[PDB]
Amino acid sequence: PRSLKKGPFIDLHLLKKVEKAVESGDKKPLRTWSRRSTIFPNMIGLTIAVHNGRQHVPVFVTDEMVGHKLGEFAPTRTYRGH
Amino acid sequence: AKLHDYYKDEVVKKLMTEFNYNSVMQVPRVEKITLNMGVGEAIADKKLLDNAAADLAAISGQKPLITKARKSVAGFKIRQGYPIGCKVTLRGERMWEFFERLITIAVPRIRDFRGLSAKSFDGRGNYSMGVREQIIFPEIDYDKVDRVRGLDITITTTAKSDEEGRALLAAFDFPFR
Amino acid sequence: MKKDIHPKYEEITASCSCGNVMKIRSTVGHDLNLDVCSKCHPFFTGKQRDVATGGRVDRFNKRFNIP
Amino acid sequence: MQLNITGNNVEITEALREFVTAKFAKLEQYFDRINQVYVVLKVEKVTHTSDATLHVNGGEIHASAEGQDMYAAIDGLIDKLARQLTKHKDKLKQH
Amino acid sequence: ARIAGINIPDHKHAVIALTSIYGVGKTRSKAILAAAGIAEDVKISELSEGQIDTLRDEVAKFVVEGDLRREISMSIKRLMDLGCYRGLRHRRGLPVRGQRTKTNARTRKGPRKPIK
RNA sequence: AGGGCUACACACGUGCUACAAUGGCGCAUACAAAGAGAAGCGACCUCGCGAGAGCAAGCGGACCUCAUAAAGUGCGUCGUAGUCCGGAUUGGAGUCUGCAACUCGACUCCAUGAAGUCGGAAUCGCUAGUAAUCGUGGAUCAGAAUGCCACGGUGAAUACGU
RNA sequence: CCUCCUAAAGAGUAACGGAGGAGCACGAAGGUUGGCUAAUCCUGGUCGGACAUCAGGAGGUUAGUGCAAUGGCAUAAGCCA
Ligand SMILES: [Mg+2]
Ligand SMILES: [Mg+2]
Ligand SMILES: [Mg+2]
Ligand SMILES: [Mg+2]
Ligand SMILES: [Mg+2]
Ligand SMILES: [Mg+2]
Ligand SMILES: [Mg+2]
Ligand SMILES: [Mg+2]
Ligand SMILES: [Mg+2]
Ligand SMILES: [Mg+2]
Ligand SMILES: [Mg+2]
Ligand SMILES: [Mg+2]
Ligand SMILES: [Mg+2]
Ligand SMILES: [Mg+2]
Ligand SMILES: [Mg+2]
Ligand SMILES: [Mg+2]
Ligand SMILES: [Mg+2]
Ligand SMILES: [Mg+2]
Ligand SMILES: [Mg+2]
Ligand SMILES: [Mg+2]
Numbered sequence: 034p035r036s037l038k039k040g041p042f043i044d045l046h047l048l049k050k051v052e053k054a055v056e057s058g059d060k061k062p063l064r065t066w067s068r069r070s071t072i073f074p075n076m077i078g079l080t081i082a083v084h085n086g087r088q089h090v091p092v093f094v095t096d097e098m099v100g101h102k103l104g105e106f107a108p109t110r111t112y113r114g115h
Numbered sequence: 116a117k118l119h120d121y122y123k124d125e126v127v128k129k130l131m132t133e134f135n136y137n138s139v140m141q142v143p144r145v146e147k148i149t150l151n152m153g154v155g156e157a158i159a160d161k162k163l164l165d166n167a168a169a170d171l172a173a174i175s176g177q178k179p180l181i182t183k184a185r186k187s188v189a190g191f192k193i194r195q196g197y198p199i200g201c202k203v204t205l206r207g208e209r210m211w212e213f214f215e216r217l218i219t220i221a222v223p224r225i226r227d228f229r230g231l232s233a234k235s236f237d238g239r240g241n242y243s244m245g246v247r248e249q250i251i252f253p254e255i256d257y258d259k260v261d262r263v264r265g266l267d268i269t270i271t272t273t274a275k276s277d278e279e280g281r282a283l284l285a286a287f288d289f290p291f292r
Numbered sequence: 293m294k295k296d297i298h299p300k301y302e303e304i305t306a307s308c309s310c311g312n313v314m315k316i317r318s319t320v321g322h323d324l325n326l327d328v329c330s331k332c333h334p335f336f337t338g339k340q341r342d343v344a345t346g347g348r349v350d351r352f353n354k355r356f357n358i359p
Numbered sequence: 360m361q362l363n364i365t366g367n368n369v370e371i372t373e374a375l376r377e378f379v380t381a382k383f384a385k386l387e388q389y390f391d392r393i394n395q396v397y398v399v400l401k402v403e404k405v406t407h408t409s410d411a412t413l414h415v416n417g418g419e420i421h422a423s424a425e426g427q428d429m430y431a432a433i434d435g436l437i438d439k440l441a442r443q444l445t446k447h448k449d450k451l452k453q454h
Numbered sequence: 455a456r457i458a459g460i461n462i463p464d465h466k467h468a469v470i471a472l473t474s475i476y477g478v479g480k481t482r483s484k485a486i487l488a489a490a491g492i493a494e495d496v497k498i499s500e501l502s503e504g505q506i507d508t509l510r511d512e513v514a515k516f517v518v519e520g521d522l523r524r525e526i527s528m529s530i531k532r533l534m535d536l537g538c539y540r541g542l543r544h545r546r547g548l549p550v551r552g553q554r555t556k557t558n559a560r561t562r563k564g565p566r567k568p569i570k
Numbered sequence: 571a572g573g574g575c576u577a578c579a580c581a582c583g584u585g586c587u588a589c590a591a592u593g594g595c596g597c598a599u600a601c602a603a604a605g606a607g608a609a610g611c612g613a614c615c616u617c618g619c620g621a622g623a624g625c626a627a628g629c630g631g632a633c634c635u636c637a638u639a640a641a642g643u644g645c646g647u648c649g650u651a652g653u654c655c656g657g658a659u660u661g662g663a664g665u666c667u668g669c670a671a672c673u674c675g676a677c678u679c680c681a682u683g684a685a686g687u688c689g690g691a692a693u694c695g696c697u698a699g700u701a702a703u704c705g706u707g708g709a710u711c712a713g714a715a716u717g718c719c720a721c722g723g724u725g726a727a728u729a730c731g732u
Numbered sequence: 733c734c735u736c737c738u739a740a741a742g743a744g745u746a747a748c749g750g751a752g753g754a755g756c757a758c759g760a761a762g763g764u765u766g767g768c769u770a771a772u773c774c775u776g777g778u779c780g781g782a783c784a785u786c787a788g789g790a791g792g793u794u795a796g797u798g799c800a801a802u803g804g805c806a807u808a809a810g811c812c813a
Binding site: 061097100101105108 | 537
Binding site for chain 1: 667670671
């Protein structure tokens with residue numbers, strides 16, 4: 034994973050638009066393609082609908098989801114079986 | 116007698132106060148301990164059952180009875196009268212003695228402990244309890260073992276209500292969770 | 293108690309780690325050296341915790357130290 | 360007899376698969392010791408073609424046939440392998 | 455020869471024997487037998503009760519057996535309940551670390567399930 | 571921009587590593603060839619268990635750097651065990667490349683320690699510095715070889731015959 | 733040949749009337765003395781499961797009787813020495 038010295042990576046666009054969520058309290062879900070970005074503590078409490086390739090899917094963030102990277106909650110292949 | 120002694124002055128007098136038993140006779144006492152170990156695998160080979168017997172005799176200090184099926188059942192393909200397990204009733208000097216041992220040697224050798232349950236009671240106040248392995252008792256010698264084997268251990272009491280028992284046990288610093 | 297059917301049942305000595313020593317009757321037929329008596333045991337003594345859950349946010353602020 | 364189907368410019372449906380399997384099941388009566396075998400179907404412009412290759416107990420037998428359909432192609436092919444398989448057998452059971 | 459409430463081989467070099475403890479590998483084995491200044495080539499059978507205890511002490515420094523097995527199992531339960539990609543790999547019983555499945559992958563998947 | 575080519579009831583082909591004692595592990599110690607490097611090859615010194623980090627000599631190179639060959643050899647240990655054999659799998663903790671390693675990188679440490687006891691029918695390579703076996707380099711390339719193309723070390727077996 | 737019903741509350745009582753058994757078994761499964769009490773459900777308990785063996789409770793013969801059915805059977809005719 035990313036070196037520890039370089040700090041935790043988040044795309045700025047998404048970093049910004051979870052100040053307005055946390056300061057100017059809203060309660061909407063946010064669209065995002067930012068599967069790179071790790072989940073910061075600020076993100077706890079806010080649903081955020083991350084892209085999986087064709088659709089955005091909601092991730093109601095929690096304490097347990099911290100450090101992981103959004104896209105780690107939007108599966109990108111469909112498989113039922115054979 | 117250690118705990119018979121401990122029982123006869125320390126335990127009786129505590130429980131005496133905390134329930135307000137006017138008569139002393141009212142205080143729960145422990146009646147008897149009994150160690151079952153069924154051995155279905157007997158119908159296969161009968162040597163196994165006797166091999167248990169020595170274990171239970173080695174633990175407990177007295178020869179076990181050998182129990183037999185009350186009725187025939189086709190479920191387990193047994194027929195009324197085949198030996199399929201063996202017990203020992205313990206009642207006095209020996210009962211208090213084994214108890215002492217159980218608490219202060221055996222039970223803190225349970226492969227990864229978290230005490231015992233305090234839920235296992237029949238509703239009148241008689242504590243039942245299993246043991247997964249029989250290396251727990253140092254009476255046996257682990258490099259002379261044929262199989263891992265278990266037993267039940269049931270402490271029959273003169274306690275009236277489920278609750279009143281638990282107290283009697285605890286008052287011997289019984290390791291409940 | 294019946295005669296000459298039961299195993300020998302006698303005094304021994306059972307020396308724990310923590311120096312704790314207890315004369316006891318048993319078949320085993322010689323003195324034991326045991327390693328965890330009812331005094332030497334996490335559970336009886338009051339030690340064992342229950343595994344620290346809920347570290348993710350503490351972790352993350354300990355790990356990176358970023359504004 | 361383990362089978363394998365290809366399609367070079369042909370979609371193997373579940374007639375053309377089912378059909379080809381049944382037709383090939385005969386061949387074992389000509390020689391009991393057939394192993395894995397590969398089949399290939401082609402369409403080039405107007406020509407329907409079908410070749411197979413058959414790993415057998417001490418050999419490799421191949422033929423290809425051209426039909427105006429693929430069924431008629433495969434019909435032709437099975438007649439070609441039959442003759443080769445018999446020839447093989449007979450120069451082993453040679454007493 | 456009872457450590458961490460399990461029996462240790464008593465005819466094995468301490469180094470080798472101590473490995474039977476779940477949660478100690480070989481690095482730890484070496485450490486233990488120096489942190490508790492006990493030689494490596496010594497077999498467990500030829501020790502003193504005293505030696506075996508100072509040894510018993512070292513091992514307690516780590517998290518081992520029961521304890522460990524619990525920790526692991528929490529970590530995996532944690533993942534599956536999170537439902538992360540890594541979680542489901544654990545559910546469906548599939549290579550969790552990116553390995554191909556089109557072929558091979560038989561250690562997760564187990565032996566073959568034929569068709570029909 | 572994000573995803574996909576990396577999907578997995580399964581079938582086939584080409585490889586790698588094994589199943590051990592002509593061997594595993596620890597210490598000690600010999601003998602190559604060929605090739606690459608410019609904003610690239612990067613010593614020595616300091617830090618770190620380690621991947622690495624910091625600082626910064628030399629070299630457009632029979633001069634400097636990659637870069638200490640390995641099998642071998644001596645001394646010790648293991649004593650035929652699913653083992654001190656094997657190292658798949660998985661948890662935890664890291665490093666580096668790169669806007670960025672969730673899907674999907676290579677590597678490191680701690681723990682874990684699977685199948686496998688030499689492989690049915692079939693079937694392949696090779697006639698001498700060959701097969702077998704052991705290490706080394708390069709092209710592509712920010713990073714990403716068990717593949718490919720090259721280079722030496724040790725070094726057999728057997729051909730009556732048609 | 734045995735048991736029940738038809739059979740009309742003593743006995744007996746027919747039909748190619750309605751339903752079932754026997755053509756044995758036991759030297760103990762006989763004699764006596766001493767002792768003993770069932771089925772089944774619930775609660776708790778290593779493997780152990782609806783059902784094995786252990787402990788308690790409810791229950792009261794709903795069990796049991798070498799083999800049919802009927803009548804018996806606790807003082808047991810049931811179970812063990
Ligand atoms: Mg035809
Ligand atoms: Mg390791
Ligand atoms: Mg694109
Ligand atoms: Mg591809
Ligand atoms: Mg190989
Ligand atoms: Mg190894
Ligand atoms: Mg290069
Ligand atoms: Mg250093
Ligand atoms: Mg030639
Ligand atoms: Mg090589
Ligand atoms: Mg009458
Ligand atoms: Mg009348
Ligand atoms: Mg008449
Ligand atoms: Mg009549
Ligand atoms: Mg009789
Ligand atoms: Mg009588
Ligand atoms: Mg039960
Ligand atoms: Mg009862
Ligand atoms: Mg009845
Ligand atoms: Mg009688």
